[PDB]
């Protein structure tokens, strides 16, 4: 179980490409965007867009491929009709079923067309082991009696994966609040050690533009399966501790405690994750990490810590593997202002322990989704790295299986 706990120089990480084990990831002459990779217990869920446009939402098993290396094996694929309307899927597993919450819009991405968005959501329940001649079991679109959002005007899932606590599901989500109704005292903006900042920066940066109609607040969507035959979804806003713009977040189980991660799309370049103190209301004990950040743009580049007016960043999450020392793993982009050079990194709060470069220093790489698990009492991690192929001129996901070494030699 125990891993290498100290900073070392030897290339102990030996990532293995398992992309062709998942045959849908790899196709010739096709652009594949908006990926989702979610795992829990023994199964997983996956989604992408073949932009003959097609949306694919599938589930399967994480099994030993043979040489004691895990790989994803698909057990059920769903092709939802009208792929132009389906946006921002989020996946949670519970009791031999996978629940995929997803938004429906006829005005494009609701993030970019916030005012015109219909607000309609849809929830589909996929079976991990589908029955032949199985209606209402293989895949079945559930009915939501109501969507409780409070003072927020609209809510929407905004993240790859979530957790289940007993009989209740918790999707990562975000709340659309009218900016006029947003209550904020600009004195809370940490412009103390930032002489080029202003009090109104992080308040105006709660929307994609300073003059934005809405503001984005990350949080959770709650689905209690034991709440009548037709349960409802309730929104749970994240606390004001280290508040940032509503970004694609992720909540996952790790060693018997849920962990929360929020993407850095604002000025808070440093990674925003940590153990969850309370699920309802949401309170995340953020790490005080000072070594992992994400590539942004010109005004909010990597490692920026000063409140600025910006909406720049990329989604690179981490997975806690040793809570005692708080050692996490994730594929991050070694770049300041471009989405380039993905590196699998194992790090503590103030020290990068060991790393391994997945590609070349100038390889286009955007989204990264990392989940870790055990395989015969050994700690493995499967990461999904959006990578641009040099030849096909089309971005594409890639699946890497990295084992966390036990020794440091």
């Amino acid at each position, epitope marked *: 179980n125990n891993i290498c706990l100290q900073k070392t120089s030897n290339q102990i990480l030996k990532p293995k490409l398992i992309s062709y084990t998942l045959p849908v990831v790899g196709q010739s002459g096709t652009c594949i965007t908006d990926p989702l990779l979610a795992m829990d217990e023994g199964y997983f869920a996956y989604s992408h867009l073949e932009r003959s446009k097609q949306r694919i939402i599938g589930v399967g098993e994480v099994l030993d491929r043979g040489d004691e290396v895990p790989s994803l094996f698909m057990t059920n694929v769903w092709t939802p009709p009208n792929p132009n309307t389906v946006y921002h899927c989020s996946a949670v597993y519970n009791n031999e079923f996978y629940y995929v919450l997803c938004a429906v819009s006829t005005v494009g991405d609701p993030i970019l067309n916030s005012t015109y968005w219909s607000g309609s959501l849809m929830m589909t329940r996929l079976a991990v082991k589908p029955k032949s001649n199985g209606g209402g079991y293989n895949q079945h679109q559930l009915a939501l009696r109501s969507i409780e959002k409070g003072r927020y005007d609209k809510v929407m899932p905004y993240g790859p994966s979530g957790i289940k606590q007993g009989d209740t599901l918790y999707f990562p989500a975000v709340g659309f609040l009218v900016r006029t109704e947003f209550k904020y005292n600009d004195s809370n903006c940490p412009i103390t050690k930032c002489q080029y*900042s202003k009090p109104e920066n992080c308040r105006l940066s709660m929307g994609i533009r300073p003059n934005s109609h809405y503001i984005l607040r990350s949080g959770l969507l709650k689905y209690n399966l034991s709440d009548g035959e037709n349960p409802k979804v309730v929104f749970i806003e994240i606390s004001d501790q280290r508040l940032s713009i509503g970004s694609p977040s992720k909540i996952y189980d790790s060693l018997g405690q849920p962990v929360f991660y929020q993407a850095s799309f604002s000025w808070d370049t440093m990674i925003k994750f940590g153990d969850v103190l309370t699920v309802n209301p949401l309170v995340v004990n953020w790490r005080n990490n000072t070594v992992i950040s994400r590539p942004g743009q010109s005004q909010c580049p990597r490692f920026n810590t000063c409140p600025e*007016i910006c909406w720049e960043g990329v989604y690179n999450d981490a997975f806690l593997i040793d809570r005692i020392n708080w050692i996490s793993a994730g594929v991050f982009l070694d770049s300041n202002q471009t989405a380039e050079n993905p590196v699998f990194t194992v790090f503590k709060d103030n020290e990068i322990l060991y790393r391994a470069q997945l590609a070349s220093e100038d390889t286009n790489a955007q989204k990264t989704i990392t989940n870790c698990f055990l395989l015969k009492n050994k700690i493995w991690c499967i990461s999904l790295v959006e990578i641009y192929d040099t030849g096909d*001129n089309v971005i594409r996901p890639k699946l890497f299986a990295v084992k966390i070494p036990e020794q440091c030699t």
Partner: antibody
């Protein structure tokens, strides 16, 4: 329209000082990233420095690192460039360039491109 | 650090197409921009983000990027197109923007 008006160029000993000013009109000056691109007579352009919209982040080139210092006054809608320890190589026309990108994106395949350019200011480092 | 290589000069006949090569190590993974500079004038941008054209730029100006070379193709070359062209990029290996040597396009006839 948008226009950049450089000034402050001239004639200076090697190792001397010189500060150029760039007056900007036609856009919200605080919202954009400004840069200094210099071009020797009869040669290609070269990027000297750059500064974020709020002035929090300053980016220099290795050729002028430690000798040039970029600054910005968003209230006066003006961009500066303090040149110290000038070498005879620095003799060039100095343009003032504004980042031309406008929109709400998360990542830019080209985070740096210029629109428009100024009209340059002549700087001659000679004895 | 990063290196952009441009051929020194290009000659094309009027009405035909003129293709300006911009070479760079794995330049496909990089956003290439194009600047036209007529004599005594400041450089004007004619193509940005590989293929996007600025407002007011003639539609016959088109940029393409694939592999180790991005080519700015000037379709239906006119007499006024006689200018110096520079491709530009951002090198995230040193946080510099890099230009090319330039290409003086002379129109024949």
């Amino acid at each position: 329209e948008v226009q950049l008006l450089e000034s402050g160029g001239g004639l200076i000993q090697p190792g001397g000082s010189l500060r150029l000013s760039c007056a900007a009109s036609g856009f919200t000056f605080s919202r954009f990233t400004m840069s200094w691109v210099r071009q020797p007579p009869g040669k290609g352009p070269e990027w000297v420095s750059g500064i974020s919209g709020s002035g929090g982040h300053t980016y220099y080139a290795d050729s002028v690192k430690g000798r040039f210092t970029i600054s910005r006054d968003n209230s006066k809608n003006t961009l500066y460039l303090q040149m110290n320890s000038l070498k005879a190589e620095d003799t060039a026309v100095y343009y003032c360039a504004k980042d031309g990108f406008v929109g709400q994106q998360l990542m830019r395949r080209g985070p740096w491109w210029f629109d428009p350019w100024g009209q340059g200011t002549l700087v001659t480092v000679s004895s | 650090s990063y290196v952009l290589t441009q051929p020194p000069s290009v000659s094309v006949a009027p009405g035909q197409t003129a293709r300006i090569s911009c070479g760079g190590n794995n330049i496909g993974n990089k956003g290439v921009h194009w600047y036209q500079q007529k004599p005594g004038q400041a450089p004007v941008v004619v193509v940005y983000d590989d293929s996007d054209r600025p407002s007011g730029i003639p539609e016959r100006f088109s940029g393409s990027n694939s592999g180790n070379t991005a080519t700015l193709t000037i379709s239906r070359v006119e007499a006024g197109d006689e200018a110096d062209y520079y491709c530009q990029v951002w090198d995230s290996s040193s946080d510099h923007v890099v230009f090319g040597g330039g290409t003086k396009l002379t129109v024949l006839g």
